[PDB]
Ligand binder design. Structure first.
Ligand code: HEM
Length: 292
């Protein structure tokens, strides 16, 4: 198991990272038109999870720390197609703040997007360090969507995530949508695409789902309301343990926010050793809380 010790960007503290937060949040506001006015919030949240989700607990490869990845077929793979827009969004931020590492920026982008879409506060730690010499390909490390509950449970054990963590994670605020041309799946999980909610769980339990074939010839669960669920999403109510938790989050927004917050931060911090002398996690204020 390689060891990856967090190292604070030289001389930086809270206020420096809140400035990066603010520029990300302000660009989020400014580039409102992206993806039929969904904006960049959702792809940023997906970007943070994708780079973090390359981690393997068994040898500590991958993860957010090194910020250095090689994306299968340079994003023209259904597993990662669409993420380049997220990296392109963060390039001007990186140019404005060249001192932040890549792992810190990718992960802070996901935290910023969640909060600015009114999701829970997500504490965030700095100190990931680029590892240009050691690149992690995402190839085969992220999960397939045409699978069942056992697949999902087993996949996530590699990320040291349990049933609750997994169900909290996948709902992912019901942000954004699947795009047929990226992934071979089409449609949103809910009606409020760029607001962080527990509506994934509600829709899953309350919508009338039909198992259909999309124009890419892949099966997905569809509702007359125009929502969709991937086979892996749907499995969360086919498995009896997952189903209980789905119901729990459907019925308690605050519990879901708190569980999501813990699991997302954990996900974003996997693979990383924080010195005992490391600063405490930062909780960034939103633009709205700052009156900006
Ligand atoms: C079993 C695990 C999961 C599967 C199979 C998977 C599958 C998918 C697929 C197929 C898409 C569509 C990509 C495209 O068409 O644009 C996608 C979207 C997305 N994923 Fe995942 N995902 C899973 C886990 C996660 C989790 C844990 C998060 C974050 C906590 C998440 C975040 C998102 C978000 C926010 C998008 C929307 C992107 C956009 O609107 O541009 N996913 N995912």
């Amino acid at each position: 198991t390689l060891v990856h010790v967090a190292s604070v960007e030289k001389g930086r503290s809270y206020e420096d990272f809140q400035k990066v937060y603010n520029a990300i949040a302000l660009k989020l506001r400014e580039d409102d038109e992206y993806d039929n006015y969904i904006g960049y919030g959702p792809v940023l949240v997906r970007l943070a999870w994708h780079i973090s989700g390359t981690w393997d607990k068994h040898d500590n490869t991958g993860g957010s720390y090194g910020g250095t990845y090689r994306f299968k077929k340079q994003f023209n793979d259904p597993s990662n197609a669409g993420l380049q827009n997220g990296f392109k969004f963060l390039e001007p931020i990186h140019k404005e703040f060249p001192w932040i590492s890549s792992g810190d920026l990718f992960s802070l982008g996901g935290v910023t997007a969640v909060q600015e879409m009114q999701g829970p506060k997500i504490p965030w730690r700095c100190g990931r360090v680029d590892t240009p010499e050691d690149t992690t390909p995402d190839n085969g490390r992220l999960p397939d969507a045409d699978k069942d509950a056992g697949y999902v449970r087993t996949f996530f054990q590699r990320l040291n995530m349990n049933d609750r963590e997994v169900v909290a994670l996948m709902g992912a605020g019901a942000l954004g949508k699947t795009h047929l041309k990226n992934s071979g799946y089409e449609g949103p999980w809910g009606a409020a695409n760029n607001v962080f909610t527990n509506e994934f769980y509600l829709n899953l339990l309350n919508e009338d789902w039909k198992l259909e074939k999309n124009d890419a010839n892949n099966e997905q669960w569809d509702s007359k309301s125009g929502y969709m669920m991937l086979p892996t999403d749907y499995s969360l109510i086919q498995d009896p343990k997952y189903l209980s938790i789905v119901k729990e989050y459907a019925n308690d927004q605050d519990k879901f926010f708190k569980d999501f917050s813990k699991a997302f931060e954990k996900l974003l911090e996997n693979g990383i050793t924080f010195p005992k002398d490391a600063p405490s996690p930062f909780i960034f204020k939103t633009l709205e809380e700052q009156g900006l």
